[PDB]
């Protein structure tokens, strides 16, 4: 996952979860990457799938 083209003003709502370094499961890549931007690049990917 590359969050370079983010942030995006909207995300689709399909579910294909990723596990963030904050131990939160993100519902999809778009949700994930917008959180990464929102944390000012502090949040990273732990692994794919639910945490």
């Amino acid at each position: 996952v590359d969050c370079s083209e983010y942030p995006k003003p909207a995300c689709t709502n399909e579910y294909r979860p990723l596990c963030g370094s904050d131990n939160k499961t993100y519902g999809n890549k778009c949700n994930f990457c917008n959180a990464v931007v929102e944390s000012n690049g502090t949040l990273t990917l732990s692994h794919f799938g639910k945490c």
Binding site: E5, N13, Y15, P17, N28, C30
Partner: protein
């Protein structure tokens, strides 16, 4: 199985929008972004109960797809959770609506704007969307937006979430019904 229930494709989970039919052929509508590149749909994460196979998929530009039922025994209720749906209708500004989806369950709100353009990025832009103040979260895609016994839209995408509040766009259901020649029941 009914509107709002979970559906699984090879890639992830979405929500069933509405059970529709044409003559004796049953199908269900869901989001186009969910049907894009999916062939078979199942009713469970284990993929043991088959639902059917995709028959049409329209995304981007629009955001609707239809799946033809191949499972003969699964009940195909013309409802949303227990709510009966009897007809389809055009969204209007100020209309009170409700959404049901497989991750968040049922949430209400109102139509805030019509014919909105949502740019999901990479050339995925959808047009003609209904804007509302209803929240939705991953997994809720393709679930129904209804008002009373009237079908109105299919969940597409948005921002925010159900804890803090958000904005969700829906694809008008009438357009989908018309493209495929099917009707709610």
């Amino acid at each position: 199985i009914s509107g709002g229930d979970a559906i699984y494709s090879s890639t992830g989970r979405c929500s069933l929008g509405f059970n529709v039919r044409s003559g004796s052929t049953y199908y269900f509508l869901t989001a186009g972004h969910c049907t894009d590149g999916a062939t078979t749909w199942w009713a469970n994460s284990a993929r043991t109960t088959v639902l059917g196979t995709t028959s049409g998929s329209s995304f981007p530009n629009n955001d609707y797809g239809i799946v033809r039922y191949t499972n003969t025994t699964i009940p195909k209720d013309g409802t949303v959770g227990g709510q009966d749906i009897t007809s389809a209708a055009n969204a209007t500004v100020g209309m009170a609506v409700t959404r049901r989806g497989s991750t968040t369950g049922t949430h209400s709100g109102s139509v805030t704007a019509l014919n909105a353009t949502v740019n999901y990025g990479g050339g995925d832009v959808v047009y003609g969307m209904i804007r509302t103040n209803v929240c939705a979260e991953p997994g809720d895609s393709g679930g129904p937006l209804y008002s009373g016994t009237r079908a109105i839209g299919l969940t597409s995408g948005g921002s925010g979430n159900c804890s803090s509040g958000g904005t969700t766009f829906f694809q008008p259901v009438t357009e989908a019904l018309s493209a495929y020649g099917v009707s709610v029941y």
